[PDB]
């Protein structure tokens, strides 16, 4: 029966063996009678408290079990850890499972604390805690799949057991890539990110064949230009080349300009010149330009039926940029040449906009562009806009062109010319961190010429983009709270926002200072700065800050910016974005609604979510006009390069755009948003897409920068062309050798059908006798009597959502070597001799 | 997989908490 617990009195004796027997019996019967031993408490504890007792460990185990039954695990862990061996190593009972779970929770919390302060100040860890933790690690390792020990380790830092897990049998190294995914998806500690990446690259290096793609995509985060430079050097000296060519191509497609400049500088300290040429991006830019030119197809019919619908309002400017979006990087000014009287029908800043559109059409033309800009436009507005457009062409790719703009700013009329020249110089020298350009733009800002300073702020932000120069931010803010001309404040807003791009918590004191500043433009700038500093990673602290500002602040502009920052904060996880903004879209004030629409447009890039589309469906009927314009622009941005089979609202939204643009009594801003949406939907001739994410899951800094300064068009129309930096070509290039583009034939896996390029009186009844007449006429009349795939060549455009439905050209003699499951540029593994089919148009 | 589920759940819980806090603030402002 065992219905009594008088054995506890055996602990009250003095002989040791009595206490040992009582402790053993209690441990045997803890699971049932914990009610009585709950009152013993101290009598057991003193047994462990005395050092001279023989079996203090058994007493500690009994007390731990009793406390666990009570529920106060914070002491059950202590008393279990105090006991040794038989305490938990049995790993058999549910009590053991609970104790190990709780103690390893304590261990991981303590590991986080130690990682916070690793400067010797880190608190010590009981060696028994480490022992049970790594015993659990080894048990779950030798037990089954090792994809749980890795997660526990990266939770508790513990890079040693991480390396042990990956370096053990590990089944296949594929899980390593899975770990990499975790390292880039479900962790926000940059300090831990560095160590995890270093471990990953070391593990890649010690393999028989290092995974060059993974190590390069880790080193781009690690910011080690000399490391990847010597990696390329040893790859070349290993007679590999092809993989080095690839690694360079993804390096340019993902890494920042300064990283590539440092890499080429280190390489400068036969094959090496080719390496430098493709690292500078000449070949990549030429290939992208060739793909855009050859695959250019813009439906001028929609532009025709729009240009006859404009009532000579200001919307012409929007059309001026809309076709530009449809002709970005396609060098196709066919509409501009064909329709020229209306091109000249607009002047003042519209001339600036037209020249900017002409330049942005000729995006990435490189050597030709210098004389090309003069050919069409050889008038302060004209020259300023030409300088701005030349800056547009060489976006992040200026080089010697920078020098031109440099001198082209010194000889300026201190007017619109200076504004355009500064904007172009800042755009082209994006992130170059050159001291001379910074000093010249600082002088331009100090000129205090309103519009000139307005452009100088953006230029100084672009040149200092993500630089975190203390001098830069100091001078910028010192001018920010010293000058009038609120336009210059608007420029300096984005200027200081861009200097802190993606820096995370590198300096949040500036965000606090900007949010606490009295000037409303300064608070708007603070929200923009938090958006730029926390791009990608959905840091909930920053999202909470901006939501609180958007809900509590009094200025409508800062609320708009705070809501718009949601896109910049959540583009990496587009699913969460409609959830939060499901109701931001229904505020009592319309500014928050516009911010909600813009955030919806920014966060999900081109995903056919059909949830953001659903939210924007009724909002485009809002009585307020500018919220309708923002909704139209956002719906266009989310719905680029999509069709009816992809989502059932593309044709409906196209005809809605037409029916609002052709309307006459609607607000000018509503039709402005309509034509902007028309330009965005078919932007780039159905050949480019906007995506802040890169191919390898990296954040594309030019894309986010450009979309931010495009959303900054409420205060300045000329900034709209900046959206050009957000487009990425949706192409895959069949380049095998250094200069060969063989006609390799590969198909797709389109299941149901094909998709992609979309589109190119009354009679009265008189029922008296009409029925009889018709029936007798009827008697008189009686008396009278799909593919599933497409063959493609080297410059083949592939939809971003269709990047996984391709087929390996195994039927062809030549098959690629790089994993062909994503867009960009790939390599082709060339088979045996008799190589032919050379294409070079 | 299991760790992925755990991290999904943590992130979703934090996001829901942020949304709830914003709702309480906006309810207060709407009452005002």
Curated annotation (Swiss-Prot), chain A:
BP GO terms, sorted: proteasome-mediated ubiquitin-dependent protein catabolic process; regulation of protein catabolic process
Residue positions, PTM Phosphoserine: 768
Protein name: 26S proteasome non-ATPase regulatory subunit 1
Alphabetized GO MF terms: enzyme regulator activity; ubiquitin protein ligase binding
Compositionally biased intervals (Basic and acidic residues): 776-785
Short name of any one Pfam family annotated for the protein: RPN2_C
Subunit structure: Component of the 19S proteasome regulatory particle complex. The 26S proteasome consists of a 20S core particle (CP) and two 19S regulatory subunits (RP). The regulatory particle is made of a lid composed of 9 subunits, a base containing 6 ATPases and few additional components including PSMD1. Interacts with ADRM1. Interacts with ZFAND1.
Swiss-Prot record, chain B:
Annotated compartments: Cytoplasm; Nucleus
Oligomeric form and interacting partners: Component of the 19S proteasome regulatory particle complex. The 26S proteasome consists of a 20S core particle (CP) and two 19S regulatory subunits (RP). The regulatory particle is made of a lid composed of 9 subunits, a base containing 6 ATPases including PSMC4 and few additional components. Interacts with NR1I3. Interacts with PAAF1. Interacts with TRIM5. Interacts with ZFAND1.
Function recorded in the entry: Component of the 26S proteasome, a multiprotein complex involved in the ATP-dependent degradation of ubiquitinated proteins. This complex plays a key role in the maintenance of protein homeostasis by removing misfolded or damaged proteins, which could impair cellular functions, and by removing proteins whose functions are no longer required. Therefore, the proteasome participates in numerous cellular processes, including cell cycle progression, apoptosis, or DNA damage repair.
Family to which the UniProt record says this protein belongs: Belongs to the AAA ATPase family.
Protein name: 26S proteasome regulatory subunit 6B
Gene name for this UniProt entry: PSMC4
């Amino acid at each position: 029966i065992t219905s009594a617990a008088g054995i506890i009195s055996l602990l009250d004796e003095d002989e040791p063996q009595l206490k040992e027997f009582a402790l053993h019996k209690l441990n045997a019967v803890v699971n049932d009678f914990w009610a009585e031993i709950s009152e013993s408490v101290d009598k057991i504890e003193v047994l462990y408290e005395d050092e001279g007792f023989r079996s203090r460990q058994f007493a500690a185990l009994v007390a731990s079990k009793v406390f666990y039954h009570l529920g106060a695990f914070e002491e059950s862990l202590n008393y279990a850890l105090g006991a040794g061996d038989l305490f938990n190593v049995n790993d058999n009972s549910e009590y053991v499972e609970t104790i190990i779970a709780k103690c390893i929770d304590h261990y991981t919390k303590q590991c986080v604390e130690n990682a916070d302060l690793p400067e010797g100040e880190k608190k010590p860890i009981d060696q028994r805690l480490e022992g049970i933790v790594n015993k659990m690690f080894q048990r779950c390792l030798d037990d089954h799949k090792y994809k749980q020990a890795i997660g526990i380790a990266l939770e508790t830092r513990r890079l040693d057991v991480f390396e042990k897990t990956i370096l053990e049998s590990n089944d296949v190294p594929g899980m390593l890539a899975y770990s990499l995914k975790l390292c880039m998806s479900l962790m926000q500690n940059k300090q831990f990110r560095n160590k995890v990446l270093r471990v990953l690259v070391k593990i890649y290096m010690n393999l028989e064949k290092p995974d060059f793609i993974n190590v390069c995509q880790c080193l781009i985060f690690l910011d080690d230009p000399q490391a990847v430079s010597d990696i390329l050097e040893k790859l070349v000296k290993e007679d590999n080349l092809l993989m080095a060519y690839q690694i360079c191509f993804d390096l340019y497609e993902s890494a920042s300009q300064q990283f590539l400049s440092s890499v080429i500088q280190n390489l400068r300290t036969d094959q090496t010149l080719k390496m430098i040429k493709i690292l500078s991006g000449e070949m990549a830019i030429e290939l992208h330009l060739q793909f855009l030119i050859r695959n250019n197809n813009t439906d001028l019919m929609i532009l025709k039926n729009t240009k006859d619908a404009v009532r000579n309002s200001v919307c012409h400017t929007a059309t001026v940029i809309a076709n530009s979006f449809m002709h970005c990087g396609t060098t196709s000014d066919q509409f501009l040449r064909d329709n020229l009287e209306w091109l000249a029908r607009a002047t003042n800043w519209a001339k600036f906009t037209a020249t900017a559109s002409l330049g942005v059409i000729h995006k990435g033309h490189e050597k030709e562009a210098l004389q090309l800009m003069a050919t069409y436009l050889p008038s302060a507005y004209q020259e300023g806009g030409g300088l701005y457009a030349l800056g547009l062409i060489h976006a992040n790719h200026g080089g010697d062109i920078i020098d031109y703009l440099l001198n082209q700013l010194k000889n300026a009329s201190n007017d619109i010319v200076r504004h355009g020249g500064s904007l172009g110089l800042g755009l082209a020298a994006m992130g170059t961190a050159r001291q001379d350009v910074y000093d010249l733009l600082k002088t331009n800002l100090y000129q205090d010429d309103a519009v000139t300073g307005e452009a100088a702020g953006l230029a100084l932000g672009l040149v200092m983009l993500g630089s975190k120069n203390a001098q830069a931010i100091e001078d910028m803010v010192g001018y920010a709270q010293e000058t009038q001309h609120e336009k210059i404040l608007r420029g300096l807003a984005v200027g200081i926002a861009l200097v802190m791009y993606g820096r995370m918590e590198e300096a949040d004191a500036l965000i606090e200072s900007l949010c606490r500043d009295k000037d409303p433009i300064l608070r708007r700038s603070g929200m923009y700065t938090v958006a730029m500093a926390y791009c990608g990673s959905g840091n909930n602290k920053a999202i909470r800050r901006l939501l609180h500002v958007a809900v509590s602040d009094v200025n409508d502009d800062v609320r708009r910016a705070a809501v718009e920052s949601l896109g910049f904060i959540l583009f990496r996880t587009p699913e969460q974005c409609p959830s939060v903004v499901s109701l931001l879209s229904e505020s009592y004030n319309p500014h928050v609604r516009y911010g909600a629409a813009m955030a919806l447009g920014i966060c999900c890039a081109g995903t056919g979510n059909k949830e953001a589309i659903n939210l924007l469906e009724p909002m485009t009927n809002d009585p307020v006009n500018y919220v309708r314009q923002g909704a139209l622009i956002a719906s266009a941005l989310i719905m680029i390069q999509q069709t009816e089979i992809t989502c059932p609202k593309v044709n409906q939204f196209r005809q809605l755009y037409s029916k609002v643009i052709n309307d006459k009594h609607d607000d000018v801003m509503a039709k402005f948003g309509a034509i902007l949406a028309q330009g965005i939907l078919d932007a780039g001739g159905h050949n480019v897409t906007i995506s802040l994410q890169s191919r390898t899951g990296h954040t594309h800094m030019p894309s986010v920068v450009g979309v931010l300064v495009f959303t900054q068009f409420w205060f300045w129309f000329p900034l709209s062309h900046f959206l050009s930096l957000a487009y990425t070509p949706t192409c895959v290039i069949g380049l095998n050798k250094d200069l060969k583009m063989p006609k390799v034939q590969y198909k797709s896996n389109c299941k149901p059908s094909t998709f992609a390029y979309p589109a190119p009186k009354v009679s009265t009844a008189v029922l008296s006798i009409t029925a009889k007449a018709k029936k007798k006429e009827k008697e008189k009349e009686k008396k009278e009597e799909e593919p599933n795939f497409q063959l493609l060549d080297n410059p083949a455009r592939v939809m971003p959502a269709q990047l996984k439905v391709l087929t390996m050209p195994e039927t062809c003699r030549y098959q690629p070597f790089k994993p062909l499951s994503i867009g960009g540029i790939i390599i082709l593994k060339d088979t045996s001799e008799d190589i032919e089919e050379l294409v070079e148009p | 997989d299991l760790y992925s589920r755990y991290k999904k759940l943590q992130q979703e819980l934090e996001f829901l908490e942020v949304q709830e806090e914003y709702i309480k603030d906006e309810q207060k402002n709407l009452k005002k």
